[PDB]
Design a protein around this ligand. Structure first.
Ligand SMILES: CCCCCCCCCCCCCCCCCC(=O)OC[C@H](COP(=O)([O-])OCC(O)COP(=O)([O-])OC[C@@H](COC(=O)CCCCCCCCCCCCCCCCC)OC(=O)CCCCCCCCCCCCCCCCC)OC(=O)CCCCCCCCCCCCCCCCC
Ligand SMILES: CCCCCCCCCCCCCCCCCC(=O)OC[C@H](COP(=O)([O-])OCC[N+](C)(C)C)OC(=O)CCCCCCCCCCCCCCCCC
Ligand SMILES: CCCCCCCCCCCCCCCCCC(=O)OC[C@H](COP(=O)([O-])OCC[N+](C)(C)C)OC(=O)CCCCCCCCCCCCCCCCC
Ligand SMILES: CCCCCCCCCCCCCCCCCC(=O)OC[C@H](COP(=O)(O)OCCN)OC(=O)CCCCCCCCCCCCCCCCC
Ligand SMILES: CCCCCCCCCCCCCCCCCC(=O)OC[C@H](COP(=O)(O)OCCN)OC(=O)CCCCCCCCCCCCCCCCC
Ligand SMILES: CCCCCCCCCCCCCCCCCC(=O)OC[C@H](COP(=O)(O)OCCN)OC(=O)CCCCCCCCCCCCCCCCC
Ligand SMILES: CCCCCCCCCCCCO[C@@H]1O[C@H](CO)[C@@H](O[C@H]2O[C@H](CO)[C@@H](O)[C@H](O)[C@H]2O)[C@H](O)[C@H]1O
Ligand SMILES: CCCCCCCCCCCCO[C@@H]1O[C@H](CO)[C@@H](O[C@H]2O[C@H](CO)[C@@H](O)[C@H](O)[C@H]2O)[C@H](O)[C@H]1O
Ligand SMILES: CCCCCCCCCCCCO[C@@H]1O[C@H](CO)[C@@H](O[C@H]2O[C@H](CO)[C@@H](O)[C@H](O)[C@H]2O)[C@H](O)[C@H]1O
Lengths: 81, 188, 68, 170, 494, 100, 73, 85, 72, 80, 85
């Protein structure tokens, strides 16, 4: 049984049992605004992460695909003989 | 210094202060609204004169005594005689809190009056050029480092040139340990 | 002033005007009302404090005995 | 990536807490849970990346406290000890969220509960990924606030109030 | 004319307009309120213009006007990096002070607005004047309009409360007057630039300290002496309480960087142990009795005493860190104490008409938005990281410890006991059961006015707590001229 | 060395950081003296900041071997940590001290 | 000023607050009150001040290494 | 989480005195909770055996009095752990 | 099954709307607007912090030593 | 079920518009690769120059207030 | 400080294995007392010696009782004494 509650109370987190009908549309919109903020934070990390050791050419290290310091090293290392 | 007979001086305050309070009881009887008579000054208002006599004798005696005990003459004794005076003031009202309160209020005044200098008579005159005295203290902007160190002392963030070598000595004399900090670098 | 008795010791089943704090509306209150209420430090009534110092003393002695 | 691990649990909490009206109970549950799920994969990856290659990661973002001799950065360092701590923290957070989709199903206030869960995860990340002792102390205090907010989630129970004061002040 | 006089004249122009509009119309009181609020917006606009043009590492006074027409008492207005943020706090606070108390005054509305517009002038002045006798003049001109702000718009015990603040603040300020008068006689002026050159003899500085400290212990206030604050900061209207705590309390915090640190250094150094003992005691005794307070507004007032002690101990550390942390904790208390008087004296007292904490319980159930802001404000008062209050305490306590390690350790008890009073009050009102049974009818949650002044004040506390360098960059160079000391290999260079 | 920035000319002290032979009633000279002592103390403490930033990179670069490879940086940083504090000018303004 | 919402003002609690606000009018100097008024105001702060006096500049942790001593005096 | 399931499965009751049987009603919970108790007690070749019992033997490994004392002390801690489990 | 979302925001019942009291006008345009304009301008304000100055010199002193590398 | 829907609201847009505005302004006001400040930056440092204007004005005032410090001693300390 | 080599080699097999013996011994003992012989524990609980040892531990070493009464309530009365006196 659901608790009785006053219906005049406004709460940013819904209050009691609050689910809107349009919640899937609101949820989807919030997903993109999150995914956009995370994308800005990822491009920040890629360009500001600092490593003093460099990954081996053959071992799994997916950071090699987005981090400038590493990618600039392997591009320079891809120049010899 | 020259010792002073405390008992003699103590009586003088009793007669000087008590003498004035006797004149106050005379005012009380003269303004009495009934036919109380002349001898009422010693019966109805006698306690008025006694408390003046008590306070006067305690003060001058206790101060003169404290003057002899400390072998010094300064603002301090005017305090001790003051506290023992207010102590006698509250003894009449029979309340313990007033004994302490009057003594605090009484003694703090007499010390403050003396330490600040004798204001109610002629203030002491230094007999020196005030323009020179004021101008020196306005343009005395820097001082010899040794002068400031005496009042505050080296340390507490005042580390004058050579503090470490002196500190070495101070610690060696007290703890008895030679100071030899570690290089904290493996080469040289 | 009423006795300084905490309302933790009142009945949890009376006809309290305020059931949560165990209070009736116009009842007199001890001047220490702040810290006599149901939302106040708890009173533990398992043993007297004197006996507890003994028992915690016994545990300490045994702990030292095992160490020895 | 490394600075994205830190940010995702924070972002989901904001949606669930100050926007629970808009997404609803299910909308909050998905965003809170999924955002913490995503962070967990990112940290499984970071374990192989930092530990299994002996490549510590540094990032510095800006100053926090800049007085002479005292410069504390809003900065993070991923090392061998860091990535060890994250794996239990993020999996147990990820699974407890999923567990809670059914445990708290009848509770009136789910958007507030799942928000506090995301908020708690953010603060442990901050605690184990700081450069300095003082930013460590932000998570140290942060998890302390998050504990008080969750031992007292049913704030109408006086017992719960007493135990949260005890958690806070101890 | 100088741009620092424009800060002074605008509230003066605003008082003129409030008194001369009814002559162009039985005009509404709503139009009285709009004029006063617009005219405090302009001061804030100007004050940010002054801050953009400031020079963060200049050792000369800035925005000065060359007078060259000397008299006996001349206003000299200069801004310095140690005074700029006190001015900015004043000009941000006074609009919220007006908005907070927008519907609550109800009578003598013109007189209320004219006092606050007068107060903003006098409190702006006290940070802007370049003399210590000028400082005293404005530091004590705020006294008559505050006697009337409490007796006209104050609560039940308003008459005794207005006598207490006036007479205590008058008495304590007259011991500061004797010491200022001595400094002027010795030096010939009280203009800052001529005083900071001059070095007083140790014994004189030991007696100027006794006199500037009597005043500031009366105006901090320390524990033995705070009986005026527990009356005045409570019986006063809401707007009075915001100015009294946020701004008036800081007149002595900023007055130690001018009156003690640069001109009486040997005294400050040798007497610090007396200050620290007093400060440690007021961190304990005030913390102990803030637990047992049954008046919500009085509980907030008592919190200010414990906070002020931490900044007083910081300004006496002879360290660059405790000095900046003291300014930051002065600013931090400004925003946070303001919000908690808005919660206590301006929302619960608006709805319940009582301040007794016995009638409140479980206000989260019907006012969730009040609870959210009330908890954030309560955590800043508890000195929690991410707020500007935490930074101010961390740096204040550090310098207290580096200077005298034992008192800092007793000052750090605050960390424990500030948290205990703040959470206990919050738990009793918002949490702690269900909506109380003394509430016969329901209570509305925050209005759009109440939300946005709390939101504004809370936002200042967080963003300044994340990036305190917004305020630290101005302080570093100017604060670096009140430290007293030398190091052996860095001093007396050749 | 690094070219001296344009912003690094308006704030560069023109005077030795001392008070010897400085007339105090000459305010501009006195204020510039004060400013010259403040900036030397601040450059000294920012020199430690930069060495500490190098030490940090050396620490994370060498890892277990930090105990042998970063000692020169350790030595410089530990010298600045006792040599440099920002102590102000107020003591030096009000006291004259000499080598003798 | 503004009319507030209806409160079941408790006759008991109102007089309890009216007791506290007027409490100081009845304080007396007894042997008990002097003892508390003496310990809190004099003894405890005097005790704190004495420790503050005797430990002033006694210790510095700044830059001190092994082989050096924390004590400065 | 396992004990969370048993509390929910009944009435949100939490007391041991009023729980019994419930092994048939909750088949998964008992196994998983016994998965946990076997590792909580560090039964051989559990996730706890490789960590909890290494501290005990590394305690005795540091051949000092304090090491031996805490071995004996923590060993008693182990036996009362197995007991309430 | 979840209930519909509800509540009177600002106490405004679903029929009518929030009536403007007076403060809203200057507080939203003047008070806050002044802070956004302050924030926008604060970006272009030159940095006169003592540290930006002390860093540039202190780098040049360390550059003479082997402690910091000199580009030249 | 029901069909009471929820608009995302102004608070959503001010928070998002707040986030967009900060990134946009911050990117615009960056100095550049090496020196070369913006026209706005060159304008700002120009208006608030005061290269010696505070020092020239404060030096004059200090001189005169030193002068009247001396003159008040002379008049108030005269021979009776 | 390192002990890994000693803990790998120095410790005898008895102390290396001892926690397993205790766990396998007291587990079957505990099951037997809790189910097979369900009378011994009540003799203990209703002995006076066991009534006290039981309530000493159930009450968590009386620690809460002492903190709440001697530490917490001392602070509340100190605050009251400062406020009133
Ligand atoms: C920093 C620390 C922050 C700590 C967290 C605080 C989060 C905010 C509280 C929780 C959210 C809340 O209460 O929302 C309800 C409330 C209204 O919810 P809604 O569903 O948008 O309703 C819109 C109204 O119907 C229609 O609008 P209205 O009736 O709310 O009127 C106000 C509205 C429009 O006003 C006018 O049109 C006049 O906005 C303005 O006043 C415009 C200027 C706002 C400036 C705020 C500062 C910007 C920087 O939100 C607000 O009013 C807050 C606005 C600003 C939020 C900023 C932070 C968002 C979260 C991050
Ligand atoms: C050392 C520094 C000081 C330590 C004490 C700090 C707190 C001072 C007292 C603050 C009390 C606030 C009012 C009490 C409200 C309340 O009900 O709180 C209950 C709580 C305790 O809860 P409780 O024990 O009353 O709850 C019993 C009932 N159950 C178990 C069902 C919930 O009060 C506290 O937390 C007091 C502080 C204890 C601090 C212990 C850690 C330090 C120990 C050092 C030795
Ligand atoms: C960040 C996420 C914040 C989530 C806030 C959720 C919310 O709005 O709850 C309102 C809730 C109500 O949300 P609700 O929608 O569950 O409403 C329930 C129904 N009522 C409450 C009306 C009976 O209010 C409270 O519970 C009051 C306490 C607010 C606590 C604030 C949490 C964040 C505090 C900052 C922590 C930072 C630590 C730093 C170190
Ligand atoms: C819960 C936390 C939520 C945080 C939300 C906001 C995040 C803001 C992130 C800003 C990132 C800046 C990107 C550019 C890198 C720094 C460039 C620079 O010079 O910035 C100056 C200043 C301090 O940064 P800096 O001196 O570089 O610090 C050293 C480590 N980088 O850096 C600045 O300009 C900072 C000024 C803005 C203040 C940020 C916090 C306000 C809230
Ligand atoms: C709610 C929390 C998140 C709020 C939004 C955060 C992202 C938007 C930041 C707005 C201000 C603009 C800014 O300074 O952005 C810096 C950066 C993205 O801009 P970018 O161009 O990468 O800057 C570096 C130079 N190229 O972006 C960043 O550096 C973002 C850093 C976010 C905080 C990281 C974690 C620190 C706290 C834990
Ligand atoms: C350092 C030195 C000090 C520390 C070491 C010594 C500590 C004290 C040792 C003596 C007391 C040990 C426990 C004695 C038995 C007892 O009281 O056990 C109570 C406990 C709980 O039983 P309960 O759930 O209440 O009801 C019976 C359910 N079968 O019973 C159970 O859990 C039942 C199963 C175990 C029963 C036998 C326990 C033997 C322990 C030896
Ligand atoms: C309660 C009140 C306690 C005392 C209040 C302050 C009393 C001041 O009275 C005191 O007199 C002495 C002796 O003249 C002076 O004290 C000083 O005088 C001259 C300067 O005038 C100094 O160089 C000298 O070192 C010192 O004795 C000061 O004038 C004042 O410190
Ligand atoms: C040094 C002195 C002390 C410093 C503090 C100075 C405080 C000054 C207060 C403001 C001046 C007096 O303020 C004055 O209050 C009276 C109250 O009768 C108002 O007078 C009016 O009040 C109400 C307002 O609705 C009218 O209905 C009434 O008919 C009329 O008398 C004036 O319009 C206002 O200008
Ligand atoms: C967070 C703030 C920290 C700073 C404040 C507290 C600092 C405390 C520093 C204590 C150590 C100071 O320096 C320390 O002096 C004490 C003085 O008894 C000495 O202590 C020793 O003294 C005697 C010899 O006199 C020894 O026989 C004895 O075993 C030991 O007590 C230490 O050999 C010395 O290292």
């Amino acid at each position: 049984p659901k608790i009785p509650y006053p219906k005049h109370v406004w709460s940013p987190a819904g209050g009691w049992y609050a689910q809107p009908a349009n919640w899937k549309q609101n949820t989807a919109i919030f997903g993109l605004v999150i995914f956009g903020i995370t994308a800005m934070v990822w491009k920040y990390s890629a360009e500001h992460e600092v490593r003093h050791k460099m990954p081996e050419p053959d071992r799994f290290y997916p950071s090699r695909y987005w981090v400038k310091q590493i990618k600039d090293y392997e591009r320079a290392q891809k120049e010899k003989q | 210094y020259h010792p002073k007979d405390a008992v003699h001086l103590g009586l003088k305050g009793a007669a000087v202060v008590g003498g004035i309070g006797l004149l106050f009881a005379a005012v009380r009887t003269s303004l009495a609204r009934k036919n109380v008579g002349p001898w009422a000054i010693f019966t109805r208002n006698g306690k008025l004169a006694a408390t003046f006599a008590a306070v006067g004798g305690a003060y001058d005696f206790t101060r003169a005594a404290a003057a002899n005990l400390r072998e010094k003459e300064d603002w301090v004794n005017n305090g001790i005689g003051g506290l023992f005076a207010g102590a006698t003031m509250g003894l009449t009202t029979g309340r313990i809190p007033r004994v302490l309160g009057f003594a605090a209020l009484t003694g703090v005044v007499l010390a403050t009056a003396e330490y600040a200098g004798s204001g109610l008579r002629g203030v002491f005159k230094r007999d020196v050029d005030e323009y020179e005295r004021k101008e020196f203290l306005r343009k005395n902007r820097r001082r010899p480092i040794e002068e400031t160190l005496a009042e505050i002392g080296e340390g507490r963030g005042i580390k004058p040139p050579g503090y470490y070598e002196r500190r070495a000595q101070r610690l060696k004399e007290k703890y008895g340990v030679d100071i030899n900090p570690v290089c904290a670098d493996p080469d040289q | 002033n009423p006795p300084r008795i905490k309302r933790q010791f009142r009945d949890p089943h009376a006809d309290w005007w305020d059931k949560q704090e165990r209070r009736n509306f116009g009842e007199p209150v001890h001047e220490d009302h702040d810290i006599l209420g149901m939302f106040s430090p708890y009173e533990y009534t398992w043993i007297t404090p004197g006996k507890g110092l003994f028992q915690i003393g016994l545990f300490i002695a045994s702990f030292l005995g095992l160490c020895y | 990536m490394y600075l994205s691990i830190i940010i995702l649990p924070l972002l989901g909490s904001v949606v669930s807490g100050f926007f629970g009206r808009k997404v609803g109970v299910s909308g909050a549950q998905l965003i809170t849970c999924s955002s913490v799920i995503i962070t967990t994969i990112l940290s499984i990856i970071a374990f192989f990346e930092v530990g299994f290659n002996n490549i510590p990661v540094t990032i510095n973002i800006f100053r926090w406290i800049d007085s002479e001799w005292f410069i504390i950065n809003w900065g993070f360092q991923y090392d061998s000890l860091t990535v060890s701590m994250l794996i239990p923290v993020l999996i147990i957070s990820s699974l407890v969220h999923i567990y809670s989709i059914s445990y708290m199903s009848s509770d009136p206030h789910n958007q507030r509960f799942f928000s506090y869960l995301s908020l708690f995860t953010f603060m442990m990340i901050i605690l184990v990924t700081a450069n300095n002792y003082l930013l460590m102390f932000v998570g140290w205090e942060g998890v302390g606030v998050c504990s008080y907010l969750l031992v007292s989630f049913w704030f109408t129970r006086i017992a719960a109030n007493q135990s949260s004061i005890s958690a806070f002040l101890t | 004319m100088s741009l620092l006089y424009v800060l002074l004249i605008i509230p003066i122009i605003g008082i003129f307009l409030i008194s001369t509009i009814d002559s162009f119309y039985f005009f509404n009181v709503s139009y009285y309120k709009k004029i006063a609020l617009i005219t405090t917006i302009l001061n804030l606009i100007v004050s940010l213009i002054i801050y953009i043009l400031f020079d963060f590492s200049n050792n000369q006074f800035q925005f000065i006007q060359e007078n060259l027409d000397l008299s006996f008492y001349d206003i000299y207005l200069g801004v310095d990096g140690v005074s700029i943020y006190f001015v900015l706090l004043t000009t941000i606070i006074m609009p919220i002070a007006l908005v907070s108390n927008w519907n609550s005054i109800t009578n003598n509305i013109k007189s209320y607005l004219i006092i606050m517009l007068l107060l903003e002038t006098l409190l702006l002045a006290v940070f802007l004047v370049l003399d210590v006798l000028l400082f005293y003049i404005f530091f004590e001109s705020i006294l008559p309009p505050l006697f009337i702000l409490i007796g006209l718009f104050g609560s039940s015990n308003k008459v005794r409360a207005s006598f207490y603040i006036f007479l205590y603040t008058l008495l304590g300020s007259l011991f500061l007057l004797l010491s200022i008068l001595t400094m002027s006689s010795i030096v010939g002026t009280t203009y800052f630039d001529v005083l900071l050159k001059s070095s007083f003899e140790y014994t004189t500085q030991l007696f100027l300290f006794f006199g500037i400290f009597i005043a500031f212990a009366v105006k901090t206030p320390v524990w033995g002496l705070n009986s005026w604050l527990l009356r005045a900061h409570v019986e006063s209207p809401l707007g009075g309480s915001i100015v009294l705590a946020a701004i008036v309390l800081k007149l002595s915090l900023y007055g130690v960087f001018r009156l003690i640190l640069p001109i009486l250094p040997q005294a400050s150094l040798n007497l610090t142990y007396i200050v620290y003992a007093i400060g440690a005691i007021t961190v304990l005794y005030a913390s102990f009795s803030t637990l047992r307070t049954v008046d919500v507004k009085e509980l907030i007032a008592y919190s200010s005493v414990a906070h002020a002690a931490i900044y007083l101990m910081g300004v006496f550390s002879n360290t660059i860190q405790g000095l900046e942390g003291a300014i930051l904790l002065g600013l931090a208390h400004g925003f946070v104490s303001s919000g908690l008087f808005i919660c206590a004296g301006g929302i619960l007292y608006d709805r319940t008409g009582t301040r007794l904490i016995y009638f409140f319980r479980g206000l989260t159930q019907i006012m969730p938005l009040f609870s959210l802001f009330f908890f954030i404000l309560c955590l800043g008062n508890a000195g929690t990281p991410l707020t500007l209050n935490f930074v101010g305490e961390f740096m204040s306590l550090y310098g207290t410890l580096e200077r005298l390690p034992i008192a800092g350790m007793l000052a750090s008890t605050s960390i424990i006991f500030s948290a205990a009073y703040s959470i206990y009050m919050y738990n009793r009102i918002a949490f702690g059961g269900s909506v109380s049974l003394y509430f016969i009818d329901c209570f509305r949650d925050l209005t759009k006015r109440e939300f946005f002044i709390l939101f504004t004040l809370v936002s200042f506390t967080v963003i300044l707590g994340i990036y305190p360098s917004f305020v630290l960059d101005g302080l570093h160079y100017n604060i670096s001229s009140v430290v007293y000391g030398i190091e052996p290999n860095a001093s007396y260079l050749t | 060395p690094t070219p001296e920035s344009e912003a690094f000319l308006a704030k560069k002290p023109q005077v030795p950081p001392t008070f010897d032979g400085v007339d105090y009633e000459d305010n501009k000279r006195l204020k510039q003296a004060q400013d010259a002592i403040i900036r030397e103390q601040w450059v000294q403490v920012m020199m430690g900041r930069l060495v500490r930033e190098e030490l940090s990179k050396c620490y994370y670069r060498e890892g277990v071997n930090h105990l042998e490879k970063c000692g020169k940086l350790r030595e410089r940083y530990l010298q600045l940590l006792a040599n440099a504090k920002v102590k102000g000018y107020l003591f030096e303004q009000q006291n004259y001290w000499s080598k003798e | 000023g503004l009319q507030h919402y209806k409160i079941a003002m408790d006759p008991a609690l109102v007089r309890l607050g009216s007791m506290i606000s007027n409490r100081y009018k009845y304080f007396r100097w007894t042997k008990r009150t002097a003892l508390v008024s003496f310990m809190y105001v004099v003894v405890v702060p005097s005790t704190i001040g004495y420790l503050a006096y005797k430990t002033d500049g006694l210790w510095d942790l700044r830059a001190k290494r092994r082989g050096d001593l924390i004590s400065e005096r | 989480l396992g004990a969370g399931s048993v509390i929910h499965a009944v009435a949100d009751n939490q007391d041991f005195r009023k729980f019994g049987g419930l092994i048939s009603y909750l088949p998964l919970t008992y196994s998983v909770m016994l998965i946990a108790s076997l590792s909580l007690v560090a039964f051989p070749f559990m996730t706890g055996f490789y960590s909890k019992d290494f501290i005990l033997e590394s305690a005795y490994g540091q051949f000092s009095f304090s090491g031996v004392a805490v071995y004996i002390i923590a060993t008693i801690g182990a036996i009362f752990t197995t007991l309430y489990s | 099954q979840y209930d519909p979302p509800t509540g009177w925001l600002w106490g405004v019942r679903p029929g009518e709307k929030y009536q403007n009291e007076g403060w809203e006008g200057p507080f939203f345009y003047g008070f806050w607007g002044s802070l956004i304009v302050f924030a926008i301008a604060y970006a272009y304000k030159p940095d006169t912090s003592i540290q930006t100055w002390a860093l540039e010199e202190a780098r040049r002193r360390l550059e003479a030593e082997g402690i910091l590398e000199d580009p030249n | 079920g029901h069909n009471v829907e929820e608009p995302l609201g102004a608070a959503f847009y001010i928070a998002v518009g707040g986030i967009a505005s900060s990134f946009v302004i911050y990117n615009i006001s960056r100095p550049g690769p090496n020196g070369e400040p913006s026209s706005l930056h060159k304008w700002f440092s120009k208006i608030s120059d005061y290269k010696d204007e505070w020092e020239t004005r404060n030096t004059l005032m200090a001189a005169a207030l030193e002068q009247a410090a001396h003159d008040k001693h002379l008049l108030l300390t005269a021979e009776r | 400080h390192e002990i890994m080599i000693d803990t790998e080699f120095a410790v005898p097999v008895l102390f290396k294995l001892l926690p397993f013996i205790f766990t396998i011994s007291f587990s079957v003992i505990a099951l037997t007392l809790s189910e097979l012989l369900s009378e011994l524990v009540i003799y203990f609980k209703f002995s006076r010696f066991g009534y006290n040892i039981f309530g000493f531990f159930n009450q968590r070493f009386l620690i809460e009782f002492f903190y709440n009464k001697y530490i917490t309530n001392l602070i509340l009365n100190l605050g009251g004494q400062i406020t009133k006196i």
